Design a protein around this nucleic acid. Sequence first.
DNA 1: CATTAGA
DNA 2: TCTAATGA
Length: 327
Amino acid sequence: ETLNGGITDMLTELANFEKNVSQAIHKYNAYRKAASVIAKYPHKIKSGAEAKKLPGVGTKIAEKIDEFLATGKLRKLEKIRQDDTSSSINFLTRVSGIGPSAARKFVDEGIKTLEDLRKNEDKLNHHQRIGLKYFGDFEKRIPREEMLQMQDIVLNEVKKVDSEYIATVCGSFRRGAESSGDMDVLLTHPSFTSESTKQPKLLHQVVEQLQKVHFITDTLSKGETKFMGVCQLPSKNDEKEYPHRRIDIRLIPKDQYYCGVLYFTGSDIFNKNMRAHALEKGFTINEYTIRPLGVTGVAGEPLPVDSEKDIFDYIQWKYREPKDRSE
DNA sequence: CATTAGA
DNA sequence: TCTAATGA
Ligand SMILES: [Mn+2]
Ligand code: NA
Ligand code: NA
């Protein structure tokens, strides 16, 4: 956590670089288990060999470990950090919709800067166009203060359309959080569950309304179950317009709401821990259900959930307010 | 780890 | 169809 800190960080730097700048999924996977492992190790790594003994740590890494322990640096790390090319990829990748793949290609073509990206909007597909358009707004944290006004808005229309729609804004926002990166609204309806062959309109109506009033301004991707767009709160009585925010809305079979909800509520650790817990308690939990465990090694049979509670109850725990799902 | 876009 | 990018 702090004892093998640089070690893993240097490790993680390395990996990432292979994966993105290079297209070396192996080396990249190398740097990772190694970083994974040295990280679990209970003692101050004193040298390559010491590390070396580790599963996954080879002569390659161990070698880097020395130079890094010997001098507070690494050449490769220094050279890479310098490398205009790899820098460039590191950056373009920031655009919503630009993966490494396209970052390399763009670069190859010679698009390195944002401005480059601009003179060639054409080479860009819609997602990246929008991604480019709101590049500034996408990088900004969402003040909870607005989260409240946005949630306010969603809920309302949602209800306005059908009164049967149930919506929840998940994420850190739900868990207290002072700010968040984007909003996640999970959604379901009663007319839609595991069997009952869809109702694409379900999602559509809603999105339609949102847009109708101008809360949603763009569409990144809209499918029959997952809409991914852009919203913005009414820029009041001028002098102050609001930043463009990312929003995600997803239809959910009423029969798996809470699990989903439980899940996307996090935290990443609370979950795991919760998850690790159902296990002893004779269960199993995943994003959509909670099945009682059987001795044969495994077992099925999706227990019925009406609220976040049932899940708790099942696993027999103290209902934990979102606020304290912190870990 | 599954859901959309695109080509 | 596969392959990328998001989320998470
Ligand atoms: Mn989010
Ligand atoms: Na080894
Ligand atoms: Na990106």
